[PDB]
Amino acid sequence: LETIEIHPITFPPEVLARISPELSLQRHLSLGIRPCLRKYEEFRDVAIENNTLSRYADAGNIDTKNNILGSNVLKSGKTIVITSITGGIIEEEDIIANYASVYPVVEVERGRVGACTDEEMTISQKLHDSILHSRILPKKALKVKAGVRSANEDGTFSVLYPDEKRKWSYVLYAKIVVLSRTGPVFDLCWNSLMYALQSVKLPRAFIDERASDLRMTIRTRGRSATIRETYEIICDQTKSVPLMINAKNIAFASNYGIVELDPECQLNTVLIADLDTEAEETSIHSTISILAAPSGNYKQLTLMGGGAKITPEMIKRSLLLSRVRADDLSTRFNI
Amino acid sequence: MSLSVAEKSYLYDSLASTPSIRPDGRLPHQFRPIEIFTDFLPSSNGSSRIIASDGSECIVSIKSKVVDHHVENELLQVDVDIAGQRDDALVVETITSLLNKVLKSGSGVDSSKLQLTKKYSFKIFVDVLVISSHSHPISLISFAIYSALNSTYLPKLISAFDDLEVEELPTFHDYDMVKLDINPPLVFILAVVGNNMLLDPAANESEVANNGLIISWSNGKITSPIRSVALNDSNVKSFKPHLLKQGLAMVEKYAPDVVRSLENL
């Protein structure tokens, strides 16, 4: 003893993390930097392109093989999130049940042949949940009415507008796929969702004269109720009025970590903003997820205190970082 | 694989030389003994049981409904289902695609032998059960569909429907059936082992072949779909333009005889 040696040779960061992320994280931390070799309170930059995927990307092309309502591509680090928002049609304050939700599928690709994995499903539902409790989309907005589409015998056809029997509401989905996830992806999914939602337009919708007496003769081999009325409602996207949305309730996310440094365990409490590598995802067990909106309103904070010490002092700094990041993204893409 | 290393080299040598002798010992133009049995469901429009020499068995069954065709762009639906495979393994669904494309309307098959007035088409529900597989099924299915679709009887229309007759649903004669004539393609499989192009591989041949070429015969000529396939993973090689042109030439000659023998039982 006292002479020294028997420490193994130096392994690169990646290899070091595969070997021990507990170890690799702390080592990075002593120089004051994240394992992604950047300072604690910088993040990943965010670049979006919008309407490069949506139906309504052009004015002189409306093509029938497309139906994508709003769309965004967002790249942060290497982790790329592609969002498509898509409708459907279902015939039907401050109270939670007057705000509606997106019913997303979030798909993540980490080298898994499947696409029904426990990591992606939990994302998708939690994501439905965030959208409900943030109160973005009031149900009056999907509650549309229909005019009349009447064909004439004059060899023309008139589709008659109301000002935009039965009633209808739309539903909203989001097909979000993720390529090469390297850290917590949740906030990426949420950032892109908003730029998409603020790009959503809805088709117009129409019905024939005596819609309430149009027949259904589709069901057969009953046994009664094999001839009835039904309502039938096509959608026409030759006009699309744009989404009516609550701007105040738009949030933009961030992600945090709380972790401790010990000098004898790479042989107090330290705050990281955002997580980018495998080593950070693995071993930053105490973490706070905040969605902050850019007037000093917060629509969710979720703290998971996976083991390490949290003083609320760290919590108090993160709520300010998150709003200032929210203000940065806001002005950056003018949306 | 399921054969020997020794067995595969013997075959490769056998087949790849000038005579191309093989366990049957056929020249490249000859086909193994098949047995056609038909019309065994009184409940279906037409039905087909084909037993081949490797002991492969396909059963092909034809059911229908008449439908308005202006809300449809498909008239023939193939459902393939292979005993001992599930309803979504890669090979099963790829077979479904191939077959649906072979039988695609206005492409090597009629879309005017299936219509009884110019508003109403019969949607033919092809439903295919493979009883035992251990060799490729598609050629045998093609051959079974031929005999079937020439055994397909449809309801005979009560009366000559117009498209303005009264503007209600077409309604069939009670007993009287119309024979369905309609000439489906016949899929023929060719196999390449060296520079030698051989019609109709057996199981054994399929396991050593470099590649094969699936091509189809409709209406007195060759036509699309054309597709190459690799009939193993582990004895695979590439091939030349001239060998692809010789396989054209071979089918053109040897196909017609087969369609005429298969047509009349």
């Binding site: 939990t122 939690k126 409790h133 629509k299 703290l303 998971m304 205190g305 010490k309 | -």
Partner: protein, 223 residues
């Protein structure tokens, strides 16, 4: 009433509990340490595979989001290094929600967390600390906080908050906050109010659960 808890009720399982909070009623079982499945073998760690199954209809995606929330809280509660390479399956069946399941999960979650603690106490699996969790809402009518709310009070919420805290050195010094899930609109002065109140209201709940386990354990273990 307020709360009631019983342990030992189920007999075939290593440990069990029945947690009732007014209308909300969760019955729980911990099974294990038992033989790992190979996909749920972890080297130095006990594995957790948690299942939350709702009363009405059949479990969906929602219960996985809940599983994650539960798993977060439970991983430093149960001494992971106590059993290496063994699995514990915690199966939490909801006998009544008595609310609306998609909309609010505030009472549901708080109840599961407590029934999990008790079940684990009955089970005998090592527990570093006492954990309970309390449900906190804010109603829009007064625009203020109401602690431990009923079903009616939940309907008229603008926002809802659960907190869970880890209890040491007399079960009365807050060590850490293992969860604080604050959903709906809040601003900071409310949130530190929700901690403050939160502290004292948790520590009462800890007293009540503490008391229950002593009384129910004591005729069993005798000398």
């Amino acid at each position: 009433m307020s709360v009631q808890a019983e342990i030992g009720i189920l007999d075939h399982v290593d440990g069990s509990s029945e947690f009732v909070s007014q209308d909300t009623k969760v019955i729980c079982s911990v099974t294990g340490p038992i033989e790992p499945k190979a996909r749920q073998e972890l080297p130095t760690q006990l594995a957790l595979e948690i299942i939350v199954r709702p009363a009405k209809g059949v479990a969906t995606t929602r219960e996985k989001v809940l599983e994650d929330k539960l798993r977060a809280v439970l991983t430093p509660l149960i001494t992971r290094h106590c059993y290496p390479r063994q699995l514990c399956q915690i199966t939490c069946q909801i006998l009544e929600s008595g609310e609306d399941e998609a909309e609010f999960s505030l009472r549901e979650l708080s109840c599961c967390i407590n029934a999990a603690f008790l079940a684990l106490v009955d089970a005998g699996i090592a527990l570093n600390s006492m954990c309970a969790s309390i449900p906190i809402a804010i109603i829009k009518d007064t625009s203020d906080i109401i602690v431990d709310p009923t079903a009616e009070q939940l309907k008229i919420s603008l926002s809802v908050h659960t907190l869970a805290l880890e209890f040491v050195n007399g079960g009365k010094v807050v060590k850490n906050v293992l969860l604080l899930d604050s959903n709906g609109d809040f601003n900071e002065d409310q949130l530190f109010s929700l901690l403050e109140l939160g502290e004292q209201k948790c520590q009462e709940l800890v007293t009540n659960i503490r008391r229950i386990i002593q009384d129910n354990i004591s005729p069993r273990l005798v000398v």
